[PDB]
Symmetry: C2
Subunit: 71 residues, 2 copies
Protein backbone atom coordinates (compact mmCIF):
# COMPACT_ATOMS: atom_id res chain seq x y z
CA UNK A 1 0.00 0.00 0.00
CA UNK A 2 2.92 2.34 0.89
CA UNK A 3 5.10 2.25 -2.24
CA UNK A 4 1.94 3.19 -4.05
CA UNK A 5 1.47 6.05 -1.47
CA UNK A 6 3.00 8.70 -3.69
CA UNK A 7 2.31 12.39 -3.16
CA UNK A 8 -0.88 13.83 -4.66
CA UNK A 9 -0.03 16.91 -6.70
CA UNK A 10 -2.17 19.73 -5.15
CA UNK A 11 -1.66 18.10 -1.80
CA UNK A 12 -0.14 19.94 1.19
CA UNK A 13 2.99 18.11 2.43
CA UNK A 14 1.40 17.63 5.84
CA UNK A 15 -1.44 15.47 4.30
CA UNK A 16 0.92 13.31 2.26
CA UNK A 17 2.55 12.69 5.59
CA UNK A 18 -0.68 12.07 7.58
CA UNK A 19 -1.54 9.41 4.98
CA UNK A 20 1.94 7.90 4.90
CA UNK A 21 1.95 7.06 8.63
CA UNK A 22 -1.75 6.06 8.97
CA UNK A 23 -0.87 3.67 6.23
CA UNK A 24 2.05 2.36 8.26
CA UNK A 25 -0.14 2.05 11.34
CA UNK A 26 -2.00 -0.39 9.08
CA UNK A 27 1.09 -2.52 8.46
CA UNK A 28 2.00 -2.31 12.19
CA UNK A 29 5.51 -1.16 11.24
CA UNK A 30 8.03 -1.16 14.03
CA UNK A 31 9.21 2.22 15.25
CA UNK A 32 12.51 0.94 13.73
CA UNK A 33 10.89 0.85 10.28
CA UNK A 34 8.89 3.97 10.75
CA UNK A 35 12.24 5.87 10.95
CA UNK A 36 14.04 4.09 8.17
CA UNK A 37 11.07 4.64 5.86
CA UNK A 38 11.21 8.36 6.62
CA UNK A 39 14.81 8.86 5.67
CA UNK A 40 14.28 6.96 2.35
CA UNK A 41 10.90 6.83 0.73
CA UNK A 42 8.70 9.57 2.15
CA UNK A 43 11.27 11.55 0.22
CA UNK A 44 11.33 9.63 -3.18
CA UNK A 45 7.49 9.22 -2.93
CA UNK A 46 6.82 12.93 -2.96
CA UNK A 47 6.03 15.55 -5.60
CA UNK A 48 9.01 16.95 -7.54
CA UNK A 49 8.83 20.25 -5.69
CA UNK A 50 8.89 18.60 -2.27
CA UNK A 51 11.51 16.00 -3.08
CA UNK A 52 13.93 18.36 -4.53
CA UNK A 53 13.53 20.21 -1.26
CA UNK A 54 13.72 17.07 0.85
CA UNK A 55 16.64 15.72 -1.18
CA UNK A 56 18.45 18.98 -0.30
CA UNK A 57 17.42 19.08 3.36
CA UNK A 58 19.36 15.87 3.54
CA UNK A 59 18.95 12.79 5.61
CA UNK A 60 19.15 13.32 9.37
CA UNK A 61 16.23 15.66 9.23
CA UNK A 62 13.69 15.46 12.02
CA UNK A 63 10.21 15.37 10.65
CA UNK A 64 9.66 19.00 11.84
CA UNK A 65 12.55 20.31 9.78
CA UNK A 66 11.00 18.27 6.91
CA UNK A 67 7.52 19.74 7.26
CA UNK A 68 8.89 23.13 8.06
CA UNK A 69 10.90 22.97 4.82
CA UNK A 70 7.84 21.93 2.78
CA UNK A 71 5.30 24.63 3.80
CA UNK B 1 23.92 5.96 1.47
CA UNK B 2 20.98 3.74 0.35
CA UNK B 3 18.48 6.25 -1.05
CA UNK B 4 21.36 7.42 -3.18
CA UNK B 5 21.94 3.72 -4.19
CA UNK B 6 20.02 3.99 -7.43
CA UNK B 7 20.55 1.54 -10.27
CA UNK B 8 23.46 2.17 -12.64
CA UNK B 9 22.20 2.10 -16.22
CA UNK B 10 24.33 -0.64 -17.94
CA UNK B 11 24.29 -2.53 -14.70
CA UNK B 12 23.01 -6.12 -14.41
CA UNK B 13 20.15 -6.32 -11.86
CA UNK B 14 22.14 -8.78 -9.77
CA UNK B 15 24.91 -6.14 -9.15
CA UNK B 16 22.46 -3.38 -8.22
CA UNK B 17 21.26 -5.89 -5.68
CA UNK B 18 24.72 -7.01 -4.44
CA UNK B 19 25.44 -3.32 -3.76
CA UNK B 20 22.07 -2.62 -2.17
CA UNK B 21 22.52 -5.24 0.57
CA UNK B 22 26.30 -4.75 1.18
CA UNK B 23 25.26 -1.20 1.76
CA UNK B 24 22.67 -2.32 4.28
CA UNK B 25 25.20 -4.57 5.98
CA UNK B 26 26.94 -1.23 6.55
CA UNK B 27 23.93 0.29 8.32
CA UNK B 28 23.42 -2.97 10.30
CA UNK B 29 19.77 -3.04 9.21
CA UNK B 30 17.58 -5.50 11.03
CA UNK B 31 16.34 -8.46 9.03
CA UNK B 32 12.97 -6.69 9.62
CA UNK B 33 14.20 -3.69 7.62
CA UNK B 34 16.06 -5.69 5.07
CA UNK B 35 12.64 -7.11 3.97
CA UNK B 36 10.66 -3.93 4.13
CA UNK B 37 13.32 -2.14 2.08
CA UNK B 38 13.04 -4.85 -0.58
CA UNK B 39 9.33 -4.56 -1.11
CA UNK B 40 9.60 -0.72 -1.42
CA UNK B 41 12.78 0.90 -2.58
CA UNK B 42 14.96 -1.67 -4.31
CA UNK B 43 12.08 -1.33 -6.73
CA UNK B 44 11.76 2.56 -6.99
CA UNK B 45 15.62 2.80 -6.95
CA UNK B 46 16.06 0.80 -10.11
CA UNK B 47 16.40 1.58 -13.82
CA UNK B 48 13.14 2.23 -15.71
CA UNK B 49 13.33 -1.13 -17.45
CA UNK B 50 13.74 -3.05 -14.19
CA UNK B 51 11.21 -1.09 -12.19
CA UNK B 52 8.51 -1.34 -14.68
CA UNK B 53 9.15 -5.06 -14.46
CA UNK B 54 9.39 -5.07 -10.68
CA UNK B 55 6.35 -2.81 -10.36
CA UNK B 56 4.45 -5.46 -12.37
CA UNK B 57 5.88 -8.49 -10.56
CA UNK B 58 4.16 -6.96 -7.59
CA UNK B 59 4.98 -6.94 -3.95
CA UNK B 60 5.17 -10.36 -2.29
CA UNK B 61 7.92 -11.38 -4.64
CA UNK B 62 10.75 -13.42 -3.22
CA UNK B 63 14.06 -12.03 -4.28
CA UNK B 64 14.53 -15.00 -6.70
CA UNK B 65 11.35 -14.20 -8.60
CA UNK B 66 12.69 -10.59 -8.65
CA UNK B 67 16.10 -11.50 -10.06
CA UNK B 68 14.63 -14.13 -12.28
CA UNK B 69 12.28 -11.48 -13.70
CA UNK B 70 15.15 -9.03 -14.30
CA UNK B 71 17.62 -11.22 -16.26
Amino acid sequence: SILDIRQGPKEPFRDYVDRFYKTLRAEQASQEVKNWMTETLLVQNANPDSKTILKALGPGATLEEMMTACQ
